């Protein structure tokens, strides 16, 4: 038998090309491997985690190294709003001379790619000033990578393999992750900011050479130990402070100013330092909750068992959940992915509105790239969370041990849940599409005054509550007389209200009927994607059509054409369908973000306000209008620096469309075709000297769905990325 | 020897040598009967 894959004899004995494909595709599903024990599983996962951390640190090392070596960081910091930051050098012998010239327009004498990752802005903010700073950073992270790699190896050695009990010590892990991983890391970062970033921002060099002798504040730690902490707030940077200079510089190391530094258009560094110090305290306190080796603290199991509402509406409450969660890595991974998915979206939303990095608000292409990047990542994480939730229900859920707890009662009313999600999706769909189409028809026939245009008054009211004066709602922070307004008036409110009421930033954009309709579109997307994923999870174990589905596993082709036909009945198929909806939803919201900003940055908000209420407006004024720079990256007259994006744009279209082949044409067609090819090979002279070792077969039913989805998704991203980048570069 | 020579040495190796050695090794691995 062909040895590969060694972890599955069933696959190893397969005489066809399917052996290789399925070998690759199941290599990381450790639970499914031959003769896996629970202890070996946890040990292998732990080592794999070390490997992953090393890869992250090598990637960061490479970014630092390439910028240090081939970048223009030292030149860029002298004029950050005018010079383009360099990602890395190009060496490509396929280039003709005209393309070499087109990519050599960034000050330096060799072809380069411009960076849109925002690394220069970040590194400058946090106190980096030279290529030697970057280089030593790169060296340091090489060493950290190696350390994690070594720890990975070490913890697979007999006398260093941790026990299963160590891996299920929930209370200790939570204490250390809260107080140490989060709390102390946050405290150390506040240290960096106070000792290095803030001095460097005021023109003072602080490095490893002089930091032991250079006090962050003239008063030292005397005020700290005397509880005279207000000393550290005295004398903030003036509104005329010129970043990276002493002109207008303050002495304060901790503040609560609110809003933005006028020059850099970013959050004050002294606010950021104080933020990190304050949350560090909270995290360190939070990490003393759970009982470890000294009797004080809580048991997680005891908390869960006790949380039953006495009126009985939650049944037995959270009884049994501790064991359910503690024995299921899929439950845990689903929780982790969901939570991280929410946080990644929050990062996208908060970083565009409240930027922390100097001059990044001016780098429009970077702002667009970063928003789109993080929202797409968040989308993937959310789908994965639900995928692992479904896998949990098949592989790890024990009905007996969860009887009448909150988890079991979800399954008890799954039809109520699914049918209501169906209703809300239909309700949003019919009416949102309906209004858009009303508007298109009435505008097309020359009567824009007949449009249905709903003011988003609830969102405008929430803006007013945070102090946006535009609407005249006179509520809370937008009223002078409010207790809310009075309470904060001597602290953050002056700085905050200035930023809110400034129209030349992204902090609470003006919103109108256009913003109303696309928010309901987004809501449609969230509900429908959720419908598909929830139906996936709650029907993973069985349905009327297939009552014994749990016996077939997460992923299987179907159950044949009987009982009416059962294509796409598995919980894996729900993941596959949800991916199309996730990509759609992310399309709508990123189109929205980008068009709203293109018109803001371009000084024509009216274009968005008028065009966005009917769908031809998006098609014409967004897609068609902004395509022009991109598709002229190369043409019969020559090439410019958008040539590469133009080519990638077409590559994306090609990959996407190739996906349709796998999604539309299904397996049996191809297997018959491959038979005739096997026939021809064996009957062709000379050629039939050569013999396959693996019998060629068409891809499996599930494999086709996966390969089709992969092409569809890769094509989606490789189309949109060049557009979003070249559109903005082309305009500004 | 200087550093500006490095792309012209390395890119051909990472692009035309490393992958084909890797492909060859993987091919031998997956066809072994053992």
């Amino acid at each position: 038998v062909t040895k590969f894959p060694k972890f599955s004899q069933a696959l190893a004995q397969d005489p066809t090309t399917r052996r290789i494909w399925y070998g690759i595709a199941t290599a990381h599903d450790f639970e499914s491997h031959d003769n896996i024990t629970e202890e070996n599983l946890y040990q292998r996962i732990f080592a794999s985690h070390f490997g992953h951390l090393a890869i992250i640190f090598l990637w960061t090392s490479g970014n630092l190294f390439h910028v240090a070596w081939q970048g223009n960081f030292e030149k860029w910091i002298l004029n950050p709003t005018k010079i383009k930051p360099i990602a890395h050098a190009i060496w490509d012998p396929h280039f003709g001379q005209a393309a070499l010239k087109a990519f050599s327009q960034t000050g330096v004498d060799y072809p380069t790619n411009i960076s849109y990752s925002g690394l220069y802005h970040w590194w400058y903010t946090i106190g980096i000033r030279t290529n030697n700073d970057l280089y030593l950073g790169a060296l340091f992270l090489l060493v950290i990578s190696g350390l994690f790699l070594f720890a990975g190896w070490l913890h697979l050695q007999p006398k260093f393999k941790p026990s299963l009990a160590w891996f299920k010590n929930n209370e200790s892990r939570l204490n250390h992750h809260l107080a140490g991983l989060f709390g102390v890391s946050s405290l150390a970062w506040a240290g960096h900011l106070v000792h290095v970033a803030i001095p460097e921002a005021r023109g003072q060099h602080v490095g490893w050479d002089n930091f032991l002798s250079t006090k962050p504040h003239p008063a030292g730690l005397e005020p700290f130990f005397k509880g005279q902490w207000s000393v550290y707030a005295d004398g903030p940077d003036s509104m005329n402070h010129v970043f990276n200079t002493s002109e207008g510089a303050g002495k304060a190391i901790l503040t609560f100013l609110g809003g933005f530094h006028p020059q850099t258009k970013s959050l004050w560094l002294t606010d950021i330092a104080h933020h990190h110090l304050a949350i560090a305290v909270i995290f360190i306190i939070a990490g003393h909750m759970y009982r470890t080796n000294w009797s004080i603290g809580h048991s997680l199991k005891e908390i869960l068992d006790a949380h039953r509402a006495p009126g009985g509406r939650l049944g037995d409450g959270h009884k049994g959940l501790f064991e359910t969660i503690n024995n299921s890595l899929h439950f845990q991974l689903g929780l982790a992915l969901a939570s991280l998915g929410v946080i990644t979206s929050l990062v996208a939303q908060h970083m565009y509105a409240m930027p922390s990095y100097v001059f990044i608000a001016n780098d429009f292409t970077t702002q667009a790239a970063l928003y789109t990047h993080h929202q797409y990542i968040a989308g993937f994480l959310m789908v994965g969370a639900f995928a692992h939730g479904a896998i949990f229900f098949i592989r790890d859920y024990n009905p007996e041990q969860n009887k009448n707890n909150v988890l079991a009662r979800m399954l008890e009313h799954k039809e109520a849940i699914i049918s209501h999600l169906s209703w809300v999706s239909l309700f949003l769909g019919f009416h949102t599409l309906g209004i858009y189409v009303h508007n298109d028809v009435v505008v097309a026939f020359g009567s824009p005054e007949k449009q249905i245009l709903i003011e988003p008054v609830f969102a405008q009211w929430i803006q007013a509550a945070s102090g946006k004066a535009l609407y005249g709602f006179n509520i809370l922070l937008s009223s002078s007389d409010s207790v809310a307004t009075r309470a904060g008036e001597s602290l953050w409110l002056p700085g905050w209200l200035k930023g809110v009421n400034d129209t030349n930033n992204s902090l609470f954009l003006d919103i109108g009927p256009g913003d109303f309709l696309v928010h309901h579109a987004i809501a449609l997307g969230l509900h429908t994607t959720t419908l598909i994923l929830v139906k996936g999870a709650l029907d993973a174990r069985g349905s009327k059509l297939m009552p014994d589905k749990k016996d077939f596993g997460y992923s299987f082709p179907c159950d044949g054409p009987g009982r009416g036909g059962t294509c796409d009945i598995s919980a894996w198929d729900a993941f596959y369908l949800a991916m199309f909806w996730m990509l759609n939803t992310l399309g709508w919201l990123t189109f929205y973000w980008h068009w709203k900003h293109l018109t803001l940055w371009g000084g024509n908000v009216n274009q968005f306000n008028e065009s966005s209420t009917y769908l031809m407006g998006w098609f014409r004024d967004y897609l068609w209008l902004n395509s022009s720079p991109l598709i002229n990256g190369y043409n019969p007259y020559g090439v410019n620096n958008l040539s590469v994006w133009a080519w990638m744009f077409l590559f994306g279209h090609l990959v996407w469309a190739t996906g349709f082949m796998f999604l539309i044409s299904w397996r049996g067609y191809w297997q018959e075709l491959i038979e005739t090819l096997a026939w021809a090979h064996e009957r062709t002279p000379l050629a039939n000297l050569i013999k396959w070792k693996d019998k060629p077969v068409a891809l499996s039913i599930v494999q086709a769905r996966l390969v089709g989805l992969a092409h569809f998704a890769v094509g989606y991203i490789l189309t949109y990325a060049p557009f979003v980048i070249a559109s903005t570069v082309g305009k500004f | 020897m200087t550093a500006s020579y490095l792309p012209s040495i390395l890119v051909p190796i990472i692009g035309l040598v490393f992958p084909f050695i890797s492909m060859a090794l993987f091919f031998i691995y997956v066809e072994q009967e053992e």
């Binding site: 070390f50 090393a54 070596w69 030292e74 090489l142 | 550093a3």
Partner: peptide, 28 residues
């Protein structure tokens, strides 16, 4: 700015994760 010497030091140091990666890979 960054010298040939500095680039060679980086390349030499990058052998440490390379070798260790090989070891981890094999052990997994």
């Amino acid at each position: 700015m960054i010298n040939d010497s500095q680039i060679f030091i980086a390349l030499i140091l990058s052998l440490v994760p390379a070798v260790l990666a090989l070891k981890l890979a094999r052990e997994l």
